[PDB]
Design a protein around this ligand. Structure first.
Ligand SMILES: CCCCCCCC/C=C\CCCCCCCC(=O)OC[C@H](O)CO
Ligand SMILES: CCCCCCCC/C=C\CCCCCCCC(=O)OC[C@H](O)CO
Ligand SMILES: CCCCCCCC/C=C\CCCCCCCC(=O)OC[C@H](O)CO
Ligand SMILES: CCCCCCCC/C=C\CCCCCCCC(=O)OC[C@H](O)CO
Ligand SMILES: CCCCCCCC/C=C\CCCCCCCC(=O)OC[C@H](O)CO
Ligand SMILES: CCCCCCCC/C=C\CCCCCCCC(=O)OC[C@H](O)CO
Ligand SMILES: CCCCCCCC/C=C\CCCCCCCC(=O)OC[C@H](O)CO
Ligand SMILES: CCCCCCCC/C=C\CCCCCCCC(=O)OC[C@H](O)CO
Ligand SMILES: CCCCCCCC/C=C\CCCCCCCC(=O)OC[C@H](O)CO
Ligand SMILES: CCCCCCCC/C=C\CCCCCCCC(=O)OC[C@H](O)CO
Ligand SMILES: CCCCCCCC/C=C\CCCCCCCC(=O)OC[C@H](O)CO
Ligand SMILES: CCCCCCCC/C=C\CCCCCCCC(=O)OC[C@H](O)CO
Ligand SMILES: CCCCCCCC/C=C\CCCCCCCC(=O)OC[C@H](O)CO
Ligand SMILES: CCCCCCCC/C=C\CCCCCCCC(=O)OC[C@H](O)CO
Ligand SMILES: CCCCCCCC/C=C\CCCCCCCC(=O)OC[C@H](O)CO
Ligand SMILES: [Cl-]
Ligand SMILES: [Cl-]
Ligand SMILES: [Mn+2]
Length: 385
């Protein structure tokens, strides 16, 4: 009876999580372990409210905004929700193109051209054809996740710094830019618009969906913490050339995977980016339909999302660096998504007999308060550091 939360863990591991966990351990050691533990517990409460909203109300967060809020406010949220989709695909479409570079040696541009063909072709496939591929990409992402669960024990990390990595201690502005990037990688604001896509029958799924969320977020947190702790035991404190970048993250699993660490890491990173970008493009289409009632052709949405990725490549920026930036932008979109979440789930005309418990609503606002604080904390040091 164990399986649903495995699927959610492999779907949660996107290239955005790889870039933040590897860089978080290489440049800052274990000192960001508390960020991963805090973001997961935040995402447990956040993604639980997102699922409770869809079971009771029957609609999704975009649909409720379209039917209840004034038009100028619906357009603003649709534009805000449209930028969260572009920042999500920018982390996944670029991650697949980066894995192509680690496998074949193709440049970043041509690696995106191959990623562009796969993303276009994968959208035309039906639900019955992608079923084997969903298990194929699930296999590689799962084994690479258990690889870090075993290696974190075999790497023999300095437990004095591991346990001390759970006290919220700051390391300047660079720690905040990356701590914010970890929150955006875990919460995933676009899911807050996507997850939601008879109290005996409606509180039944709230009992069933709640089990899958807490169990899956548990392993995803263990995998993310293990990956950050292995990268800390590998590159941190040793002055490695270009440490933290995804071009050398395979060396974290060299003593475990032997000479197969580079291929098994890029393949698991390619399967993670190809699946999350095709599903992310499908998710962005339902979001626009919920806000505006109409939609653009899916090929046009797929092409517009590639333009910022090709522009970053044509400029010469570091692929691993722009993946972390996209996760920071997502964390600025979390407060904009939590507000329609904490308000709709706390209305009796919207939920019915499933009004959110008064304790979870207050905690959810404090989570938004902390993220607003952490976003406001960061946003100062950039221009006056
Ligand atoms: C990801 C949340 C876990 C959901 C199901 C995990 C339990 C069964 C899975 C593997 C068995 C290996 C046991 C060692
Ligand atoms: C280490 C990662 C931080 C998260 C772990 C908690 C450590 C104590 C912090 C807040 C107390 C939580 C109060 C309980 C009510 C919420
Ligand atoms: C600082 C920048 C905040 C920007 C926009 C406000 C976002 C939150 C505003 C949402 C208020 C919810 C609302 O509009 O209330 C609906 C009312 O009942 C009408 O039907
Ligand atoms: C910047 C946020 C974008 C705000 C976009 C506002 C769009 C708007 O005002 O709605 C259209 C109006 O109803 C028709 O004139
Ligand atoms: C559900 C969470 C997944 C749990 C997998 C974590 C441990 C994996 C293999 C056992 C370690 C290998 C030791 C046994 C052979 C020696
Ligand atoms: C901060 C990180 C927090 C999360 C981290 C905990 C997660 C570990 C859970 C399961 C993996 C256990 C599997 C590891 C078992 C390997 C032991 C073994 O096989 O021993 C081989 C060694 O070579 C003989 O000396
Ligand atoms: C999770 C933290 C890693 C736990 C495994 C570390 C370990 O095995 O500690 C043995 C060490 O050699 C004894 O000093
Ligand atoms: C769900 C996982 C997080 C739950 C909350 C975590 C509590 C923080 C304490 C220990 C971390 C667990 C790993 C144990 C290794 C660290 C133990 C330790 O504190 O080491 C003391 C001394 O420094 C040795 O050298
Ligand atoms: C480059 C943008 C234009 C190239 C893509 C055009 C492909 C096309 O014609 O698609 C037709 C569509 O199915 C019907 O709206
Ligand atoms: C990534 C694709 C979405 C990015 C946003 C472009 C959406 C199309 C532009 C205006 C829609 C027209 C609305 C009716 C006026
Ligand atoms: C901004 C420069 C980017 C250059 C590549 C554009 C990507 C478009 C790919 C195919 C278009 C027809 C299908
Ligand atoms: C920068 C903060 C991002 C979002 C701020 C939201 C604050 C809106 C509070 C209540 C809305 C009115 C209640 C209905
Ligand atoms: C350096 C300091 C930086 C920190 C910066 C922020 C400081 C915190 C300010 C306000 C927190 C307010 C706590 C949130 C309480 C909201 C509870 C609530 O509104 O829930 C009611 C619900 O509607 C019932 O049905
Ligand atoms: C988009 C997320 C909001 C970002 C900006 C929020 C408004 C500024 C709040 C600062 C709290 C005080 C911080 C003190 C440290
Ligand atoms: C806003 C309060 C946060 C300012 C106080 C936090 C100390 C860290 C800091 O702001 O300094 C880093 C950067 O160089 C800029 O000063
Ligand atoms: Cl450290
Ligand atoms: Cl309302
Ligand atoms: Mn993520």
């Amino acid at each position: 009876f164990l399986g649903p939360a495995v699927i959610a863990s492999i779907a949660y591991m996107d290239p955005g999580n790889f870039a933040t966990n590897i860089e978080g351990g290489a440049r800052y050691g274990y000192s960001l372990l508390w960020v991963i533990l805090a973001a997961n517990l935040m995402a447990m409460v956040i993604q639980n409210l997102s699922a409770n909203l869809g079971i009771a109300s029957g609609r999704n967060l975009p649909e409720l905004i379209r039917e209840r809020w004034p038009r100028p406010l619906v357009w603003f949220y649709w534009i805000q929700a449209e930028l969260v989709a572009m920042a999500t695909d920018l982390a996944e479409f670029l991650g697949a193109a980066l894995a192509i570079q680690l496998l074949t040696g193709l440049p970043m541009f041509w690696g995106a051209v191959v990623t562009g063909v796969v993303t276009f072709w994968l959208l035309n496939l039906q639900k019955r054809g992608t079923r084997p591929l969903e298990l194929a990409v699930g296999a590689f992402v799962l084994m690479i996740g258990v690889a870090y669960l075993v290696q974190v024990v075999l790497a023999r990390p300095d437990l004095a710094a591991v346990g001390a990595g759970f006290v919220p201690r700051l390391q300047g502005p660079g720690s905040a830019y990356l701590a914010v990037g970890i929150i955006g990688a875990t919460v995933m604001p676009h899911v807050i618009y996507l997850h939601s896509a008879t109290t005996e029958e409606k509180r039944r799924l709230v009992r069933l969906n709640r089990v899958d969320v807490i169990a899956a977020m548990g392993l995803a947190g263990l995998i993310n913490m293990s990956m950050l702790a292995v990268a800390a035991a590998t590159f941190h404190g040793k002055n490695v050339e270009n440490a933290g970048a995804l071009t050398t993250a395979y060396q974290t699993l060299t003593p475990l995977l032997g000479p197969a660490a580079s291929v098994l890491f890029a393949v698991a990173l390619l399967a993670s980016g190809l699946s999350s970008s095709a599903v992310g493009t499908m998710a962005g289409d339902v979001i626009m339909q919920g806000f505006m009632g109409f939609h653009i052709p899916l090929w046009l949405r797929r092409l517009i999302t590639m333009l910022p990725a090709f522009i970053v490549i044509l400029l010469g920026m570091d692929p691993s660096s722009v993946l972390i930036l996209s996760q920071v932008i997502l964390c600025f979109g979390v407060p904009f998504a939590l507000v329609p979440l904490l308000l709709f789930t706390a209305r009796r005309d919207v939920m019915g007999a499933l009004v959110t418990r008064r304790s979870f609503t207050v905690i959810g606002w404090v989570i938004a308060v902390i993220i607003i604080a952490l976003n406001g904390y960061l946003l100062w040091e950039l221009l006056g550091g």
